[PDB]
Design a protein around this ligand. Sequence first.
Ligand code: CLA
Ligand code: CLA
Ligand code: CLA
Ligand code: CLA
Ligand SMILES: CC(/C=C/C=C(C)/C=C/[C@@]12O[C@]1(C)C[C@@H](O)CC2(C)C)=C\C=C\C=C(C)\C=C\C=C(C)\C=C\[C@@]12O[C@]1(C)C[C@@H](O)CC2(C)C
Ligand SMILES: CC(=C/C=C/C(C)=C/C=C/C=C(C)/C=C/C=C(\C)C=C=C1C(C)(C)C[C@H](O)C[C@@]1(C)O)/C=C/[C@@]12O[C@]1(C)C[C@@H](O)CC2(C)C
Ligand SMILES: CC1=C[C@H](O)CC(C)(C)[C@H]1/C=C/C(C)=C/C=C/C(C)=C/C=C/C=C(C)/C=C/C=C(C)/C=C/C1=C(C)C[C@H](O)CC1(C)C
Lengths: 213, 230, 226
Amino acid sequence: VRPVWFPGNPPPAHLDGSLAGDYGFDPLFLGQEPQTLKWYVQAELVHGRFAMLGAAGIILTSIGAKVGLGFPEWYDAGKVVVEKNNIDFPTLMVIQFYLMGWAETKRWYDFKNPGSQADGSFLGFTEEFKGLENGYPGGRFFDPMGLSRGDAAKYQEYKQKEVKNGRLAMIACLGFAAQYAATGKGPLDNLADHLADPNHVNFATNGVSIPIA
Amino acid sequence: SRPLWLPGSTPPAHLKGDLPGDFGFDPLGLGANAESLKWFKESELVHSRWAMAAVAGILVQEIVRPDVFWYNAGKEVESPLGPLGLLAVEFFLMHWVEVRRWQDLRKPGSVDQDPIFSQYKLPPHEVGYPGGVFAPFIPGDLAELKVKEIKNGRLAMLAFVGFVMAAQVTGKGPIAALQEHLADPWGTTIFSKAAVVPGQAVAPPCKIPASVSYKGIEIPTPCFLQGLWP
Amino acid sequence: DRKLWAPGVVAPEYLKGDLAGDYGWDPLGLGADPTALKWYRQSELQHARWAMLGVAGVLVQEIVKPDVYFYEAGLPQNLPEPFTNINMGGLLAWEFILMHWVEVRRWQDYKNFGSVNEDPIFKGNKVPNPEMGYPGGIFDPFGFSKGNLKELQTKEIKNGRLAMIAYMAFILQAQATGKGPLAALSAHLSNPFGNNILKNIGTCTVPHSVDVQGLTIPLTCLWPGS
Ligand code: CLA
Ligand code: CLA
Ligand code: CLA
Ligand code: CLA
Ligand SMILES: CC(/C=C/C=C(C)/C=C/[C@@]12O[C@]1(C)C[C@@H](O)CC2(C)C)=C\C=C\C=C(C)\C=C\C=C(C)\C=C\[C@@]12O[C@]1(C)C[C@@H](O)CC2(C)C
Ligand SMILES: CC(=C/C=C/C(C)=C/C=C/C=C(C)/C=C/C=C(\C)C=C=C1C(C)(C)C[C@H](O)C[C@@]1(C)O)/C=C/[C@@]12O[C@]1(C)C[C@@H](O)CC2(C)C
Ligand SMILES: CC1=C[C@H](O)CC(C)(C)[C@H]1/C=C/C(C)=C/C=C/C(C)=C/C=C/C=C(C)/C=C/C=C(C)/C=C/C1=C(C)C[C@H](O)CC1(C)C
């Protein structure tokens, strides 16, 4: 009675409709156990979060290119900011790994113990790192607008919208890499190449996607 | 049965006409939390009052000094009291007032009394609405003025972004942009200056330099969202 | 409801003749939901009325002047004398705001029927709106309603559907040969064997781009082949 990724086939038993963005897509039965599924919900969420941030990053910095601004492409922005700004690179990598190892191990021991990370062991914060549910921490820091409390039905709507935009941002970030490994130029240059001629500047005329050209 | 932002609509359940200016407009659900709506009401009042003072300042500054331009007015003012002495006095004098207002927000029945003239105490007012000595000779109904302040303030919040996005596209103050729109209305709109079709995007050119000199060290002036413009 | 679209067809259950122009149709199932059927009814009324305006514009602008051609009549070079070479951006701004008012008023008549009837500036007289898509009141300055509304409603829908097919004709008998509808009718009446659908389909007289004051519009036919 609910929509499924493949109409006709029933959804599997471990996958009733309670998660955000559930459509019964597990042909390989990877999340059959409830705890491995509890871990993969967290994984799909945070991959979607980083992919939404990344896709907005590529799209904004490619609107910055081709209009006339001095922005590079996304595959060139790694070099140009460690060379234009005198940034030593392995220390930037180690500072990234320090800050995000902190922020990640906090989450990694919230998964192992949901009521933890909230006993004031950190700098005096008790309810702010409480965690509302799996992959949805909330509180005063992770929800400063406070949209996780109020109308709960609209919060379930926002949960499903987050998962939807996160899925197609993961697909977009998988597609930017393929647009770059195939064509070799910017993504919004590939869009304007597909728009200047809708035929013949698609993937089937790139010489790489189909080898039977 | 109050008037709404869209007349056929139903207002959300957290917007029940209690607050002034409550016309049922919150489509993103941001005023659902009761604790967060107080902070949002305070920030709407403070954004609105700063925007009304700013819009009146830019308009009066244009009608008394047409030579100088308000976007450039922080660059050519040439005060005798130095560049950083102004910022130091503003920093301390605003870090006082803002922490006073913030502590009014956090505990309302805490901060009323003048600390150095203890005989003077502010009356038990409403949060966001100090009164007493900030408000002498209030005319007429206080709820009617409380609605008029938010209406003129929302209009001035839109007007300040209008001033900024005029002055970054035409580079002129908001009577000279109005003189552009009155001298040639059909060709001095934003749809006249810009259009994006699927295949090319004609953005308006900047009228703000990428930097200004200002006494040695140069200040970058980001033309807001150039490139993302239509 | 009777005299359906084909002689031996059973009508669907949701087409019992309540709406006008009901012919037991929809062989693609689109009206099976009632909330979808009301919106598709509104969009059929919109396409019908704008298509009647399209037909009565295209075959009247060549009556009054058979030189300005209706395809490129949107180009600023082809506008009349008080509007020749106008900035199309300001004209588009006028149309955008004056239609985003009207269409959102009509949309909120759809979303909440009866809540949008009052003149909001002049809090006075309303519009007596008997059913959705038929406001009336000031949209009947001659009062041809308040009689047999079902009769005129069927008349409106039938002339409107015929004008939809007529206007999508008028475009396609102008993409193939580059000629107006009365002018293509005269071209058929000249030689009715080489000026037909044969040997005219397959060519697209539409150019690929026309620079309108700095903008290039993609300008596609509805079939391939120039
Ligand atoms: C459009 C995608 C989207 C949507 C619908 C949501 C929706 C939700 N998130 Mg989520 N989130 C997203 C993207 C999104 N998020 C991304 C990319 C990140 C990583 C930074 C997060 C990180 C995150 C955390 C850590 C938490 C949530 C929480 C929530 C819930 C309440 C907050 C809310 O209603 O947001 C409403 C969202 C919108 C109205 C849309 C965003 C508005 C603008 C248009 C986005 C513009 C992006 C901009 C260009 C770049 C900004 C980057 C930023 C880092 C400054 C709700 C389920 C909280 C929760 O579940 O509490 C229990 C919570 O704790 N999310
Ligand atoms: C940033 C300033 C600001 C803030 C904090 C608020 C806050 C509020 N408004 Mg308000 N409003 C504002 C500006 C603001 N307004 C302006 C400028 C207008 C005129 C268009 C209005 C018109 C308006 C109406 C008509 C109503 C409200 C209402 C409300 C209340 C409930 C809605 C809510 O949750 O808002 C929370 C909102 C925020 C925290 C702002 C989030 C800003 C996001 C992050 C970015 C927004 C981008 C924006 C689209 C850019 C516009 C660009 C350009 C067009 C200017 C709340 C107290 C309702 C009310 O009074 O009920 C009590 C109501 O009916 N507002
Ligand atoms: C037109 C907009 C407007 C309106 C209707 C109000 C209305 C109100 N304000 Mg408010 N206020 C405004 C703008 C406005 N304010 C601005 C811009 C600021 C920032 C300076 C403030 C700061 C403020 C505070 C701090 C307090 C109020 C209070 C009040 C309430 C009682 C005071 C009163 O009678 O004001 C009536 C207002 C008018 C009749 C407006 C007259 C405008 C004249 C014509 C001058 C305008 C032009 C002038 C040259 C601008 C420069 C002046 C200044 C910026 C240097 C009432 C709800 C008090 C309150 O809530 O008490 C409970 C309170 O404590 N307001
Ligand atoms: C876009 C225009 C449009 C729309 C929205 C409708 C909508 C409707 N028509 Mg209608 N109709 C139209 C044009 C349209 N008609 C035309 C041009 C004709 C003459 C052929 C008819 C003849 C007709 C009859 C005889 C009857 C209806 C009926 C109906 C209703 C039920 C069918 C349904 O749910 O379809 C919903 C439709 C859509 C969601 C639109 C789908 C459009 C598809 C995607 C594209 C069309 C394919 C192709 C391009 C068409 C080529 C046209 C070209 C050769 C000229 C519904 C209100 C029945 C009725 O009145 O019941 C109350 C009925 O008996 N119509
Ligand atoms: C709105 C419309 C046209 C409006 C045109 C206008 C205003 C034109 C204005 C102008 O020209 C002038 C005046 C003068 C020019 O100088 C300027 C312009 C501006 C160019 C046409 C709609 C035209 C709409 C048409 C033809 C719709 C056809 C749809 C059909 C036949 C679908 C039927 C079905 O979908 C259903 C209904 C049910 C399913 O179950 C079965 C199937 C068959 C799938
Ligand atoms: C429904 C419909 C609408 C068409 C609308 C168009 C084309 C509007 C153009 C609308 C054109 C517009 C607005 C042009 C606007 C031009 C402007 C602003 C000119 C300018 C500029 C700029 C921008 C360079 C900026 C510069 O600094 C100033 C100035 C002055 O130099 C068409 C449908 C069809 O076309 C399809 C979809 C398929 C076809 O096969 C069949 C049919 C049915 C015909
Ligand atoms: C506190 C108190 C208390 C006590 O009791 C008493 C007293 C003292 C009296 C009081 C005070 C008060 C005050 C200060 C007030 C003020 C106000 C204001 C300023 C308003 C404005 C307000 C303002 C406003 C609305 C504004 C508006 C504006 C606008 C729309 C604009 C527009 C524009 C633009 C965009 C740009 C272009 O180019 C042009 C133009 C056209 C120009």
